[PDB]
Design a protein around this ligand. Structure first.
Ligand SMILES: *[C@H](O)[C@H](CC(C)C)NC(=O)[C@H](CC(C)C)NC(=O)[C@H](CC(C)C)NC(=O)OCc1ccccc1
Ligand SMILES: *[C@H](O)[C@H](CC(C)C)NC(=O)[C@H](CC(C)C)NC(=O)[C@H](CC(C)C)NC(=O)OCc1ccccc1
Lengths: 306, 306
């Protein structure tokens, strides 16, 4: 038993991380088959980050202007092109450690692991959620750009995020691997702000189920609610509306625990209206919303990879 | 910026995990050079675990009683021995993926990453601290024994923990990689309980420094405390004593932020006595104690590994 904010094992991704340098800027790239993907702002110059003309900056580059290294091994760039906010650097060697992979664009409320890297070297791994406002709350310093977010299933790595920027509230923005930003953000240092950060209701409910599985039952009560009456309370606390689809995907946890979805909703309603009265749930004094229902089932059932 | 509970990248350790089966008991082993290390209770049956005599149980064992699998491949066991509470299974193949490594003994308050595994395969990675009562709060199911905890440093993997057991609060206990338990526990199913948990004061202070570094300053106050008077408060809230050696260890964070260590102690005293008054620190409503001073410096400075 026990329930922790767990990341995917990172070894498949660590074998794809490379260092890309242009001019004096070094950031990270992702090496899959014979292409390295990296944020296009590696070509920016520091006096021209307000509105860079990426088109102009890129067509003036030659392949040798991009220095790519995997570990201490130089990779030779033999082509370069732009796709949205990422560059695709064609290299002369297919990465022999390429896992089975796909590029996925995730939905708000979904979770993934971030392999935070600097100078092409992994430094740490953690679990994040795509917030409803299409930012993430990560841990990223200068030089972390090009670090990726990913899920695994069986032996297939679904890459879903590449890191590009930090917004003033200390929150992070980036693209999918097609190079399109999540949310309305752009890769230039013009003033930009995140929208409303709402709480992911279906994930809070999943985590309440995880709590019951792991022996925390004090919030369970004798009440129920309709979905309508729950959502009326939820909106007042800046929680996203629960839908029938959400109720459906909570089905398996409800069955395993014997607690009906709308009874758990009644427990959550009471927690929202009354707080925890000095108690904790799975070591937290806040209602935790960065576990999906599938994350709970994976961890509580010991699902493994390859 | 940002601050997250970050684990070490797990790939170097993933390459070492194998499955070990004896009879119908299956758990994980650590394959380093030509040795597989695993908990000795793998030789216990369904009824042996109440109060096993491991010398007696090994009378009944030969090499082919240990089925070791690395991925799909059967390793052949050519010797076995008992060392403290682990078995060393000598196999006829050296692990080609053996990293540079060492075995270390950690002390309470120190942190490490756990790669939770089942059947020799990785389920996920998370960061833990060795509690003052020599347990960890992990996420472990039946079959997780033999999963290891580790730190990474420069190029070297420092293994510090191997998982053996769960105590009834959902607390976890295990050994170092020499097979000696952390804490006063034994590998048998006789009633045992850890000492009451206390809070790792030096780590809470480190995490308050992380908060200041990342822009959270609302808890800084104009008050002063002495080490003695602060410890009077710590004892009342079941915090570990803060020593002058701890004060020295916090020196670099104090210098970086301009906040004297005992001034941060005055901030923590007020938090303990009055709570957070509806505010949060680094996204938490409780005082976090599983980041060491070194963890804070390393995350706020972007230290990487290969
Ligand atoms: C890439 O390694 C680095 C990582 C960050 C976590 C710092 N990203 C950048 O440097 C990025 C490059 C630009 C060209 C996309 N810049 C930012 O992320 C920038 C950081 C601040 C501190 C300047 N954020 C930004 O420009 O947000 C837009 C903005 C501008 C002005 C006011 C508010 C918001
Ligand atoms: C190893 O895979 C498995 C992992 C746990 C997470 C289940 N560990 C064991 O099965 C281990 C083997 C024994 C011989 C060391 N047993 C325990 O950890 C046991 C599990 C409970 C659920 C029975 N815990 C235990 O025996 O704690 C001591 C104890 C006994 C009786 C009352 C209180 C405490």
């Amino acid at each position: 038993s026990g329930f922790r904010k767990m990341a995917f094992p990172s070894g498949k991704v660590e074998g794809c991380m490379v260092q890309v340098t242009c001019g004096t800027t070094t950031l990270n790239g992702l090496w899959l088959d014979d292409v390295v993907y990296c944020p296009r702002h590696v070509i920016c110059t520091s006096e021209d980050m307000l509105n860079p003309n990426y088109e102009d900056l890129l067509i003036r580059k030659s392949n040798h202007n991009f220095l790519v290294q995997a570990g201490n091994v130089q990779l030779r760039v033999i082509g370069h092109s732009m796709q949205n906010c990422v560059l695709k650097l064609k290299v002369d060697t297919a990465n022999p450690k390429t896992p089975k992979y796909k590029f996925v664009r995730i939905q708000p409320g979904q979770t993934f692991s971030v392999l935070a890297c600097y100078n092409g070297s992994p430094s740490g791994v953690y679990q994040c959620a795509m917030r409803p406002n299409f930012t993430i709350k990560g841990s990223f310093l200068n030089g972390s750009c090009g670090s990726v977010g990913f899920n695994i299933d069986y032996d297939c790595v679904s890459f879903c995020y590449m890191h590009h920027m930090e917004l003033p509230t200390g929150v992070h923005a980036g693209t999918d691997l097609e190079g399109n930003f999540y949310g309305p953000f752009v890769d230039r240092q013009t003033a930009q702000a995140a929208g409303t950060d709402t709480t992911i209701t279906v994930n809070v409910l999943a985590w309440l189920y995880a709590a019951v599985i792991n022996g925390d039952r004090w919030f369970l009560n004798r009440f129920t609610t309709t979905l309508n009456d729950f959502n009326l309370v939820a909106m007042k606390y800046n929680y996203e509306p629960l839908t029938q689809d959400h109720v459906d995907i909570l089905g398996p946890l409800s069955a395993q625990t014997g607690i009906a979805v709308l009874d758990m909703c009644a427990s959550l309603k009471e927690l929202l209206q009354n707080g925890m009265n000095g108690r904790t749930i799975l070591g937290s004094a806040l209602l935790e919303d960065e576990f999906t229902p599938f994350d709970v089932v994976r961890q509580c059932s010991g699902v493994t990879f390859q």
